[PDB]
Amino acid sequence: MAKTIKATGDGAALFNAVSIGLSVEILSGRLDSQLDTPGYQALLDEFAKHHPQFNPKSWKTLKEWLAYYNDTRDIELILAPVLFNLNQKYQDHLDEEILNELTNLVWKNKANIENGQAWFQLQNTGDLGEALFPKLENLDLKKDRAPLLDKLREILKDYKLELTRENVKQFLTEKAKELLSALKKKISSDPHAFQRGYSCDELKGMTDALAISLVENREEDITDNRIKIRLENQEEHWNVLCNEEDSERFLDSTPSRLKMTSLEAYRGDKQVSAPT
Amino acid sequence: MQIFVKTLTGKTITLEVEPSDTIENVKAKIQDKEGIPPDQQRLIFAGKQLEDGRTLSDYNIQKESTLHLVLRLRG
Amino acid sequence: MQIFVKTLTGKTITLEVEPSDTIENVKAKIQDKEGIPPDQQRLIFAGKQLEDGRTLSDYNIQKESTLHLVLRLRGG
Numbered sequence A: 001m002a003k004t005i006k007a008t009g010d011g012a013a014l015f016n017a018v019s020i021g022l023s024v025e026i027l028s029g030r031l032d033s034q035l036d037t038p039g040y041q042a043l044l045d046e047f048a049k050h051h052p053q054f055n056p057k058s059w060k061t062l063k064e065w066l067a068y069y070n071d072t073r074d075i076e077l078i079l080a081p082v083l084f085n086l087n088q089k090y091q092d093h094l095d096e097e098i099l100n101e102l103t104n105l106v107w108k109n110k111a112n113i114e115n116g117q118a119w120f121q122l123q124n125t126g127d128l129g130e131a132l133f134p135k136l137e138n139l140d141l142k143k144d145r146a147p148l149l150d151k152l153r154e155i156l157k158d159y160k161l162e163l164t165r166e167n168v169k170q171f172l173t174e175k176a177k178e179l180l181s182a183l184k185k186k187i188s189s190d191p192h193a194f195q196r197g198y199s200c201d202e203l204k205g206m207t208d209a210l211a212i213s214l215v216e217n218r219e220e221d222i223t224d225n226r227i228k229i230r231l232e233n234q235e236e237h238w239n240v241l242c243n244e245e246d247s248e249r250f251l252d253s254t255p256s257r258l259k260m261t262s263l264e265a266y267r268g269d270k271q272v273s274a275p276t
Numbered sequence B: 001m002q003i004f005v006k007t008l009t010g011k012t013i014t015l016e017v018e019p020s021d022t023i024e025n026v027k028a029k030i031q032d033k034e035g036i037p038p039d040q041q042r043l044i045f046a047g048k049q050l051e052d053g054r055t056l057s058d059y060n061i062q063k064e065s066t067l068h069l070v071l072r073l074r075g
Numbered sequence C: 001m002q003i004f005v006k007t008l009t010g011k012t013i014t015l016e017v018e019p020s021d022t023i024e025n026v027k028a029k030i031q032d033k034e035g036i037p038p039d040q041q042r043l044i045f046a047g048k049q050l051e052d053g054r055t056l057s058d059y060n061i062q063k064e065s066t067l068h069l070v071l072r073l074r075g076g
Helices: A013-026 A038-050 A059-068 A072-088 A095-114 A134-138 A142-156 A165-176 A178-188 A199-209 A244-250 A262-267 B023-034 C025-033
Strands: A001-004 A214-218 A227-233 A238-243 B003-007 B012-014 B043-047 B068-070 C002-005 C012-016 C041-045 C065-072
Touching: A001 A013, A001 A244, A013 A072, A013 A227, A013 A244, A038 A072, A038 A199, A038 B043, A059 A072, A072 A142, A072 A199, A072 A262, A095 A134, A095 A142, A134 A142, A134 B068, A134 C065, A142 A178, A165 A178, A165 C025, A199 A214, A199 B012, A214 B068, A238 A244, B012 B023, B012 C025, B023 B043, B068 C065, C002 C025, C012 C025, C025 C041
Parallel strands: A214 A227, B003 B068, C002 C065
Antiparallel strands: A001 A238, A227 A238, B003 B012, B043 B068, C002 C012, C041 C065
8 A cells, every 4th residue: 555666776776765755754744843953954954065056045945846856756866965965974983884894805805816806706795695895896996996906915915814804804904004095085085976785774873863764674663753764675776665645745746857867966067956 | 878787786887878789788888897798797677687689678778777787607 | 791693594693792782882793703784784682673772781681692683685
């Protein structure tokens, strides 16, 4: 009895899906009680910083934008990058995140790296199906990935320790200080970060601050009394659920108005014009 | 037109393509930014495996459709 | 104290924890030994899902309690 709204699979389907669902909650008014919270004013700030024609800077105007651009794809194009930028503001431990990606890469592919194996031939998943180093996979192959394997083959020439993850970790903290900072530069400035692939919890700081709970494949904590965005994931893709009573009132009201790629959206070069 | 190729990790790349493009030609675009020989790529779209001789329009693959990429060796 | 983390493949992780540790710390300890990033970890004790900011002693998790590790999916 709940409609599954298809989100676009550009690698940012988590953001696209959350955008659509968060819109319905905003236009329905069920979030009006939380619009003067720090988290939502932070969102209002990030929405204004992305849309130069967005004025006046208020939840009144932001509601009007979502009602003008009520097509789900237009909604993705104007809101997903805003939730993306807002999400970057809650990444407190990112230096450590990279250290754990690089140690997963080395621990699980030491022999592969020393034998000069191509990036696609690597082990990038774990025994439970998890993704070992998704931020590094996203960098450019020719400029970033292939050189990484080249310099890791060099550094590992001094790896005379046993092949534990603990040793790899301590080894990288001592022997790869500059390389880790170089990867922080490239990852933080990665123009295609939004295609990286995403987990719900990667957004937990922002959703928490937005008084929103993310329900993945109907695995709902009954204790949680928050507004719930219900997400669906089947083929490594994020869609969103929405009630028919809401989808007919706050979704696909209008035809598609925007003709821009997802890349053009996230980089903000192509401006979205003010409504009417 | 743009189309997306998604991996089993959720990672997605963007491809610039015309509907007149052969699947054979699509894998060559995927080799260019991932290093994967075409005979090692398996492309699935809505459960239908994509064979090299056909075009994107034969598979009703339109703008911003998402394909799935698998490695025949890994599976 | 010691707790057991059983995945559904059959592997059993044995962590050295304290009642005052958070669920966040447990997920990091799992990362230290198995490499699983916490953002893909869902920990379940006796049917209830564990919140990152609450302690083990909150959920009354005690010595040799067994926790379940479920993977959180990614999407593109």
